[PDB]
Design a protein around this ligand. Structure first.
Ligand SMILES: O=C(Cc1c[nH]c2ccc(Br)cc12)NO
Ligand SMILES: [Zn+2]
Ligand SMILES: [Zn+2]
Ligand SMILES: [Zn+2]
Ligand SMILES: [Zn+2]
Ligand SMILES: [Zn+2]
Ligand SMILES: [Zn+2]
Ligand SMILES: [Zn+2]
Ligand SMILES: [Zn+2]
Length: 203
């Protein structure tokens, strides 16, 4: 199966493992994972985080044919399970010093969900995109500004976490994938750049 291909020790995920727009897997509701995790689900999580680290690494990204990205969901690999990886980097200062924290968020999440959120909405100024979508898609993807999530880590430990800013946007984007929701589902149908008063536009 797909899973068997991905969890081979020597196999590195790359773009040839990512399914495309139109594949029915992207529109399903992914299945909850049960704990204790199987070996395949643990390794899958680890391979997904490795893909993100590679996509961020100029050398590996070039070797494998990836562009920098910040999140990945198991459905995108044709695996209909509630597994996401998120890796949101902080940026160097003007002097070229690395940030005090490499990442604002770095996690492999099992069964993640939004349990509460702000009334306020937010959107990336630059819109969104998708590893599975090879089309230009303009517009503000309207999301919750702030979210409180629950998820489980690979050990089975439950976490409850409030997120804001970019972190909030990324996690929402990935959770959407495990619910069969695409980013453009949340772009205004008639005016992609419509702004409802009070929308937080993140630069
Ligand atoms: O498809 C993706 C990665 C991805 C590519 N372009 C993006 C723009 C904004 C956000 Br949020 C996420 C992405 N994760 O599911
Ligand atoms: Zn592959
Ligand atoms: Zn392991
Ligand atoms: Zn590596
Ligand atoms: Zn609500
Ligand atoms: Zn996506
Ligand atoms: Zn919501
Ligand atoms: Zn709860
Ligand atoms: Zn539309």
């Amino acid at each position: 199966a797909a899973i068997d291909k991905l969890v081979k020790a020597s196999h590195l995920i790359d773009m040839n493992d990512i399914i495309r727009e139109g594949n029915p897997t992207l529109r399903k509701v992914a299945e909850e994972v049960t704990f204790p995790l199987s070996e395949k689900e643990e390794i899958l999580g680890e391979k997904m985080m490795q893909f993100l680290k590679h996509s961020q690494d100029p050398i590996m990204a070039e070797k494998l044919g990836l562009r920098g990205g910040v999140g990945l969901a198991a459905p995108q690999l044709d695996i209909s399970k509630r597994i996401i990886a998120v890796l949101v980097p902080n940026v160097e200062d003007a002097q070229g010093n690395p940030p005090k924290e490499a990442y604002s968020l770095q996690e492999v999440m099992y069964n993640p969900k939004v349990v509460s959120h702000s009334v306020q909405d937010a959107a990336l100024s630059d819109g969104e995109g998708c590893l599975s979508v090879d089309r230009e898609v303009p517009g503000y993807v309207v999301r919750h500004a702030r979210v409180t999530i629950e998820y489980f880590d690979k050990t089975g430990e439950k976490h409850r976490l409030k997120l804001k800013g970019y972190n909030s946007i990324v996690v929402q984007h990935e959770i959407d994938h495990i619910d069969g929701i695409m980013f453009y589902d949340r772009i205004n149908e008639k005016n992609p750049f419509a702004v409802k008063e009070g929308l937080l536009i993140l630069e």
